[PDB]
Design a binder for this molecule. Structure first.
Ligand SMILES: Nc1nc2c(ncn2[C@@H]2O[C@H](COP(=O)(O)OP(=O)(O)NP(=O)(O)O)[C@@H](O)[C@H]2O)c(=O)[nH]1
Ligand SMILES: [Mg+2]
Lengths: 171, 174
């Protein structure tokens, strides 16, 4: 209830609870595909799409990934999201994804998609040069699995609609 | 030590890929992003490549060119820094058609002064018309109030793509 993008860019750590319910997704936006790939070698590190839903074992919108320490010495990574939109029109779709490690902002990805064609299927690949991490940060991130967490906020007309979270470990 | 705040510019470069359906826009974009192009489908929406380097962002937009998607092109015009227009050089039946679309694009006020690279794509084909012939058909030499450039290319092989991108990089900030 009343979460604007501005009151989210100022957060210093992962939120303790989801800031909206699955019922808030009134535009039937459905994320259908996710991909992480190392863009230096081209290797597809992780991908899950269309009929595949999980490889497992409050809210059902939480994933967490584990890597080997080598991941933290990668140069450039590419994360792709593919989502569909429904009948209702969507003007100014926005995405704010923040990765923290214990009140330490690692990476901020703020992308404004804008207008989304109804009944469309869209993709977005964020290609980032890995953030400048001091070796102290590497030590801590490796040694503390899943204390690196991320908030994925999705807005439509500056009104939060979807909130997914994630924890990352490098052991 | 050698830790240097060389960055901190917060720049934003916007490249917009347009053209008729089947032109090769998605193939070209995924080629540029060194990505799988084994199973490309008609884009019913947009594909974005957002490439970051410490606050410098290069955002590339591939909009679908289906007959039912072209009307929505006008929604993705704002803040465009380069327009890349792709033409199937082997589909001559559609030259006229594509010629009008580009003509509509360069009259849009929202896209005024934006440099436009015309990729005469699919030059790997025997039936592919040469770039000069396409530039004739398009009347590209009458283009005034912006810098334009045509480039023979094949998104499939990659031939010529770096030449067009060299032009794009050279004629940014225009
Ligand atoms: N021979 C050849 N085929 C090409 C070349 N570039 C693209 N194609 C092919 O032409 C077709 C056009 O597909 P695509 O790349 O999706 O074009 P598009 O611009 O995305 N069309 P849409 O607007 O519907 O998404 C595909 O079968 C693609 O493989 C090229 O240089 N040579
Ligand atoms: Mg396409």
């Amino acid at each position: 209830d009343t979460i604007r993008p501005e009151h989210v860019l100022r957060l210093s750590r992962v939120t303790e609870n989801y800031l909206c319910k699955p019922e808030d997704n009134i535009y039937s936006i459905d994320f259908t595909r996710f991909k992480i790939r190392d863009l230096e070698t081209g290797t597809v590190l992780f991908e899950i799409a269309k009929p595949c839903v999980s490889d497992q074992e409050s809210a059902g919108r939480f994933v967490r990934y584990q890597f080997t320490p080598a991941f933290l010495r990668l140069r450039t990574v590419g994360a792709t999201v593919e989502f569909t939109v429904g009948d209702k029109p969507v003007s100014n779709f926005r995405m704010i994804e923040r990765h923290y490690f214990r009140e330490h902002l690692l990476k901020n990805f703020d992308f404004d998609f804008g207008f989304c064609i109804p009944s469309s299927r869209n993709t977005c690949e964020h290609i980032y040069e890995f953030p400048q991490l001091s070796e102290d940060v590497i030590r801590l991130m490796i040694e503390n699995p899943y204390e690196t967490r991320s908030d994925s906020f999705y807005f439509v007309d500056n009104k939060l609609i979807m909130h997914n979270k994630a924890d990352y470990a490098y052991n | 030590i050698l830790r240097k705040l060389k960055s901190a510019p917060d720049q934003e470069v916007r490249i917009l890929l347009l053209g008729l359906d089947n032109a090769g826009k998605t193939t070209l974009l995924k080629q540029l992003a060194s990505e799988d192009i084994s199973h490309i489908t008609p884009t019913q929406g947009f594909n974005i490549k957002s490439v970051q380097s410490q606050g410098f962002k290069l955002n590339v937009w591939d909009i679908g060119g289906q007959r039912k998607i072209r009307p929505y092109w006008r929604s993705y015009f704002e803040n465009t820094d380069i327009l890349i227009y792709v033409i199937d050089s082997a589909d001559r039946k559609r030259f006229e058609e594509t010629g009008q679309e580009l003509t509509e694009l360069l009259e849009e006020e929202k896209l005024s002064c934006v440099p436009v690279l015309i990729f005469a794509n699919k030059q790997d084909l025997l039936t592919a018309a040469p770039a000069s012939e396409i530039a004739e058909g398009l009347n590209l030499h009458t283009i005034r109030d912006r810098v334009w450039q045509i480039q023979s290319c094949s998104a499939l092989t990659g031939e010529g793509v770096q030449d067009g991108m060299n032009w794009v990089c050279k004629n940014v900030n225009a």
